[PDB]
Amino acid sequence: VYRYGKAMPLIFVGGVPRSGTTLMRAMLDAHPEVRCGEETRIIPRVLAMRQAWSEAGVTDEVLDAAMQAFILEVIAKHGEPARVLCNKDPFTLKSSVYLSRLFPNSKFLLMVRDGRASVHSMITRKVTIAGFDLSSYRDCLTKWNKAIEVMYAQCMEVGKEKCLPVYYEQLVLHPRRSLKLILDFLGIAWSDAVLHHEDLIGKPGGVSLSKIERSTDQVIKPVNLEALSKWTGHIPGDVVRDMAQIAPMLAQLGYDPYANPPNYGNPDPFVINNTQRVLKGD
Amino acid sequence: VYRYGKAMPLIFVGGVPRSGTTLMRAMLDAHPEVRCGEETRIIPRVLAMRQAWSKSGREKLRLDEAGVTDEVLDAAMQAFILEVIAKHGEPARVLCNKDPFTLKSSVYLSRLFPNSKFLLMVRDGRASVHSMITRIAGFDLSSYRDCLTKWNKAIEVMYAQCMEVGKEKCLPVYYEQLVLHPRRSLKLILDFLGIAWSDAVLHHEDLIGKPGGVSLSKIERVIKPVNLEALSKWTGHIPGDVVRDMAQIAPMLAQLGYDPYANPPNYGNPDPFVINNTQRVLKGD
C-alpha cells in the first residue's frame, strides 16, 4: 500500500539528451525502493505550455495546484509502484526551480556529459531534438551550450542541497564511488544492485525500458567505457578551432575545450571487466 | 468544510459563444448551493492538447510504451481539471464550470466525471453570428456566410456529443425558451440536475459580487435581469443572399427546431415576469 502526495521524496533526473540520463535513471530503477521508469514526453510538454501562460480566477496558486496533481498522477501511474518515486525526462531540468517550489522535497540530478560526446552521439545516431539541427556540429554545440547553461543556472539557484551535478564520465569510470555519494545526497540507504542494473531489466521492482527510446540498446549492457571518447577525431577542424567560442560552458564545467579529448581519468577494475564482458557478447 | 473528488456532481455549461451561456451560469451561481464562476480558459486548452496526443498516431505508440496510457492521462486530466474547478472561485456544495467549447468533448468529460451533468445552450445561430459579428478559435471576422457555416459545424458536433451522452446526462437548453420562460426552464433544469429549487435563481442580478452567488470577470464580453432585448434584434441585418441560402449554410437550425425560412421564427410569448424585467432595464434600474 503506497501513498503519494505533493510532499513526498521525488527524484528528477535530467540534462541534455545523450548525457547518459537513461543510464542514470536505470541504476535507480534497479534499486528496490526506487522506480523512475521511461521518459514520459508529456511532463516536459505540459511544463512548456505552463511556462508559456505566465481575472478568470486562474491565479498562479491554481495553475501550480493543477500542475502538482497532473504530474503526480503521471509518475505515480505510468510505471510499477515503489516507496521512492523518480522521473526521467531530459528537458525537465529546465524548469527545476519551479519544480522545487511545487514539490518541496523533490531532489534533482543534472547529468553533465562532454557536449562533444553528446553532440557527436546525437549527430551520428540521428536523434532529432527541440531545435537541434543535425547538419552542423557548430549549430548543435551552440545549442547544447545554450541548453546546458540554463539547466545549470537553475540547478545553482536551486542549491547544493536539492540539486546534484552528475558527471557521466565520472560515473562510467567510478560507478561505485559515484552512486554512493548520489544516493547519499539523495539520503537513501545503500544497495549494490545499482551496479548490476543490467541484471534487472523487465524484472519487477527494477528497470522498465522503452523499446523505442534511443538510449536503450546501450543501457542493456552494464556500465561500460566504450562511449567516453569515441567522439574524438570526428569534429570538423574549424569547430575544434572555434571550440571555446562555441562552447564557453565546456570550460566552466571543467571541460578543457582544447583538450582533444581531455584526460577524464582512470577506470575501476569493475568497469574494465564489464567492458571486456561487453566485447565478448554477454 | 467542502470535499471534492472525481465522482462528485459537476455541472458543465457550454455551447457556441454568444448563446447566453453567461446568463445560464450567472443564474446558476446565484443558487446558494452552486458555484460556476468565470471562464477558466485553461481547461479547454489542456483538453485540446490531450486530444491531440491521442489524436496522434506516432506519439500514442510512444506514450503507451512509456507506461503513459489513456488511464494515466485521464487520471492526470481529472486531478488537473478538478483542482482548477475546486480552487478558481468560492467553495460550493455543487461545483460548475463554464467554458464554451468544453462541450465539444463531453463524451470524454462524462467518462472522466461519472456524475457530471451537461447543459448545452442552444441559441438560433442567426442571433449568435450577428452578436459575434457586431460586438473565437475557428471563426472569420468579415463574412456572415463563413460565421454561420462555422456556427453550424460547431453546434453539429456538440449536439451529437450531447446525444451520444444521453438525455440523462445531457440537456439541450433553449436560450429563447429560457429568456421567455425563466421560471419554467429553471424548474426543468434543477429537476434534471436533481438540485433543490431556490428562489435566488430568478433574482441573479441582485447577487453579483455577493458571497455564495455570482462572480464575474470585468473583461469577459448579464448584469441586468432576464430581458427580452437580445431575442430578435438580429433580423434585418442579414445579407439577403445569406438569407436566401439559409437552409444549405445551416441545415442544423432546421433539425434543432429553428425555421431557416422564418425571419424570425415565432419564438413564443413572454412571461409577465420577463416583460416587467425588460421594463425596469429600459428605465435604468
Ligand SMILES: Nc1ncnc2c1ncn2[C@@H]1O[C@H](COP(=O)(O)O)[C@@H](OP(=O)(O)O)[C@H]1O
Ligand atoms: N551501460 C552504459 N554504459 C555507458 N554508457 C551508456 C550505458 N547505457 C547507455 N549509455 C549511454 O547513454 C548515452 C545517451 O544518453 P541518454 O541516456 O541521455 O540518451 C549514450 O551515449 P553514446 O550515444 O555516445 O554512446 C550511451 O553510450
Ligand SMILES: Nc1ncnc2c1ncn2[C@@H]1O[C@H](COP(=O)(O)O)[C@@H](OP(=O)(O)O)[C@H]1O
Ligand atoms: N440578463 C440578460 N437577459 C437576456 N439576455 C442576456 C442577459 N445577459 C446576457 N444575455 C445574452 O447572452 C449573450 C452572450 O452570452 P454568452 O455568454 O453565451 O456569450 C448576449 O447576446 P447578444 O450579443 O445578441 O446580446 C446577451 O444578450
